[PDB]
Amino acid sequence: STIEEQAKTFLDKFNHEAEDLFYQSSLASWNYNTNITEENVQNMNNAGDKWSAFLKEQSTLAQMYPLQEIQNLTVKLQLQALQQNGSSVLSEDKSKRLNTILNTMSTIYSTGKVCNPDNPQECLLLEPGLNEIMANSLDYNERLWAWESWRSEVGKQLRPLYEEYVVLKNEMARANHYEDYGDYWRGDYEVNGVDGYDYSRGQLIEDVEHTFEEIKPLYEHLHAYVRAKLMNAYPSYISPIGCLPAHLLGDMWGRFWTNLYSLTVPFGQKPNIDVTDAMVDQAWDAQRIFKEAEKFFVSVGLPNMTQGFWENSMLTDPGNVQKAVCHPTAWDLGKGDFRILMCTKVTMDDFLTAHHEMGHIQYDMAYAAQPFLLRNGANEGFHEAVGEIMSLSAATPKHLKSIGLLSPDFQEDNETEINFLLKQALTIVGTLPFTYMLEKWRWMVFKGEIPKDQWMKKWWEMKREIVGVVEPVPHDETYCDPASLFHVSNDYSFIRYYTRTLYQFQFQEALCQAAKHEGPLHKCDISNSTEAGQKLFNMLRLGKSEPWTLALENVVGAKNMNVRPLLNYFEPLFTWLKDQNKNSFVGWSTDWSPYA
Amino acid sequence: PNITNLCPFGEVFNATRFASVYAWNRKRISNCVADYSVLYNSASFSTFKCYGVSPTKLNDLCFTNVYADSFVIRGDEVRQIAPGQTGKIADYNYKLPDDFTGCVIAWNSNNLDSKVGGNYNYLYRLFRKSNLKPFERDISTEIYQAGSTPCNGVEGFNCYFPLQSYGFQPTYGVGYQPYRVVVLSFELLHAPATVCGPKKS
Ligand SMILES: *[C@@H]1O[C@H](CO)[C@@H](O)[C@H](O)[C@H]1NC(C)=O
Ligand SMILES: *[C@@H]1O[C@H](CO)[C@@H](O)[C@H](O)[C@H]1NC(C)=O
Ligand SMILES: *[C@@H]1O[C@H](CO)[C@@H](O)[C@H](O)[C@H]1NC(C)=O
Ligand SMILES: *[C@@H]1O[C@H](CO)[C@@H](O)[C@H](O)[C@H]1NC(C)=O
Ligand SMILES: *[C@@H]1O[C@H](CO)[C@@H](O)[C@H](O)[C@H]1NC(C)=O
Ligand SMILES: *[C@@H]1O[C@H](CO)[C@@H](O)[C@H](O)[C@H]1NC(C)=O
Ligand SMILES: *[C@@H]1O[C@H](CO)[C@@H](O)[C@H](O)[C@H]1NC(C)=O
């Protein structure tokens, strides 16, 4: 009869047939990931093509129902999600060119092999070995060689490709009634139609700048401390007044600073909280790791894992004969099938990763009651944030003492808290200016603020201004230095990490206030608290049915992303860094004072 | 006296194949001895919810006829086989009256009714113009008209085929795994009651 009833019946038919097609596709992808064989690749490709063609046909059918004659919010949300053209609005020649460009960038990044001139008999690919060289070497010219050679080869290959990519994506986005591709990416956080809880695409940039302005003093103090320690490590290269050299940050691009913990440790003489030896002494299997994670989730009141999870997940490396992807991934296959694919070792990192991925699984299980097209996070930030909060809670010394992995007579003094907080800052605080600068640069490129002949002059200028990192030697426009990273070269949004980082500490403060923790925020554990689990599960059960602002109201009581919980988390470290930076100079100069 | 001629519960519970919920099988059970303690004391049933009568007095009371309806549904849809419930199964597939006397027996059948490729031999009605009356069977395969336009027998836009297949797989969750449901309906009519319980010696 009415348009709304027609859309509801169409959505029922879509949900039922999409769930089965998505299951078949997901199972084919799982069979490829646990068994890398050519027939599995072919089956995966066939299932993916069927799924994509089905989504195209259903979107084409879905557009015939006008949005403004539907009043139910959930039905309108599913219809809005389905009615996106994607690349379908673009012409077939340009769509094929865009798909070819994306595939060839994926092959260039994945199969990019670079080695030293005059010694070309064997070469090293980035994923197998360049990571170890960037993370462990202490030689200035070796790291300079690796960094410049990889940006030379990858950037000189990817620069025309990226120039075509920006134009094609902008054409698709303006064909889809967006200002640019940056607006298309910012449309994930767009909330329309809810009174008071509306969020605009243009508000995201303003909120990111407003939060980063409060991030900036903590990052400046951390940068000054890291600069002083790197000056100790490398005596003459680093200037007291200038930016950090780009190739010395411990990773290939500067994404994380977590590989500088050895060089920049405050109290090396004091012990670490490493629990690897304790699990080795007690013979902890990977099954025991996941059972302890399940015990953590049942302690807070969340549902326990299904029988199908224990039967169908691969929690151990299969063997030499069978090949599998080593990356830890939680799979929501559909229809109540939840699995974890992780090559779990007996390490602290794998144990924390197990907590993180089981948090992903709990988030996936919670919105199983929702319709198929609403089975996602409210935004891209929440899905990662709910795993990161479990990673935060499990890493605490209280959790380790509670589960028996740490000695009950372990002395928790201020120095261990300072060095642990510094490690967490190098992982968490250090990625924030890089993430913000990268997303702001991509937004300005898509918006047309930066012309193609001035991309790199602005980019290094942005990096000196925001990240406080200087280029080793100047680069002209023949280089494509941003696209050497995985996310930008393969068409992925990058603001999810910034939003995830802020949502992580907002959720942590909300659950710790719920759990009646009476100390520092980093000393807080959310186990044994039913009310904290209930407050989490209220947001978890919604999925994408409700706006992310309303979900954030459900957890923290705020309608917007906030920066104060992060600053509260690192407040002991902030005072310690302010004490340690009395002699040194906080802040950097954008001039070429260290090296250029 | 010595009792023989038991009611055929082997051909209902232990059937090699069950019907779809849209075309649920109804077997009228008459003129035999119904031993209900065999069913109640079995550990193989997940749901044995009796409405309107208690299991303890089943082996004593006597009824004129017993209606055994058999079908397969999902795990999450077992709750809808009850008086007063709402859902796809209750509205469009199998409707129970509010004044229902009988028992709903359900058990997991992932072992038999699920294959690795997907078992699509079980169908359920997804759309109907109106809700079903109690104990009604709809086996019509006419195209559902959701819009003003005539369907003309072809599944196009706003016109959908009402019967949709379940895709049972052995790796599914417990809420999506196949459950075989047998509903026993007990009525007393003015005719001489012949389905009586076993008499102790
Ligand atoms: C992985 O693929 C090989 C190739 O045929 C197959 O023999 C093997 O059974 C597969 N592994 C599993 C666990 O099914
Ligand atoms: C929207 O539709 C759903 C069914 O998909 C229904 O359960 C819900 O109550 C509706 N909401 C409103 C406000 O009508
Ligand atoms: C998708 O593309 C078609 C083709 O031009 C257009 O008519 C339709 O409005 C587009 N959908 C949206 C939501 O813009
Ligand atoms: C999960 O919890 C329920 C209720 O406590 C229990 O019956 C079930 O056996 C548990 N699942 C597993 C796999 O232990
Ligand atoms: C730890 O506490 C002691 C006792 O007040 C103090 O002397 C020391 O400076 C503190 N160290 C740090 C790193 O805060
Ligand atoms: C949480 O509950 C479990 C079960 O009683 C207990 O073993 C554990 O010690 C508790 N956690 C804390 C921090 O007391
Ligand atoms: C049905 O099968 C089960 C399992 O083998 C068996 O124990 C039972 O006796 C059979 N018959 C009935 C009426 O349940």
Author numbering:
A (entry chain E): 19 to 614
B (entry chain B): 330 to 530
Give passages from the manuscript:
SARS-CoV-2 utilizes a trimeric spike glycoprotein for attachment to the host cell receptor angiotensin-converting enzyme 2 (ACE2) and for the subsequent cell entry step which involves the fusion of host cell and viral membranes. Given its crucial role in the viral replicative cycle, the spike protein represents an important therapeutic target and is a critical antigen in host immune responses. All emerging variants contain defining mutations within their spike proteins, with multiple mutations clustering within the receptor-binding domain (RBD) impacting both ACE2 binding and antibody neutralization escape, while mutations within the highly antigenic loops in the N-terminal domain (NTD) across these variants reduce antibody neutralization. Given the rapidly changing mutational and antigenic landscape of the SARS-CoV-2 spike protein, a structural understanding of spike protein mutational effects and the discovery of broadly neutralizing epitopes is of importance.
To identify structural mutational impacts on ACE2 binding we next determined the cryo-EM structures of variant spike-ACE2 complexes. Focus-refined structures of the ACE2-RBD interface enabled visualization of RBD mutations, revealing local structures which are identical to our previously reported structures using spikes harboring variant RBD mutations alone. Superposition of local RBD-ACE2 complex models revealed no significant structural changes. These structural findings confirm that mutations outside of the RBD do not modulate the positioning of ACE2-contacting residues at the receptor interface via allosteric mechanisms. Our structures of VoC S proteins in complex with ACE2 demonstrate minimal structural changes in the RBD, reflecting its functional constraints in cell attachment, only permitting mutations that preserve the ACE2 binding interface.
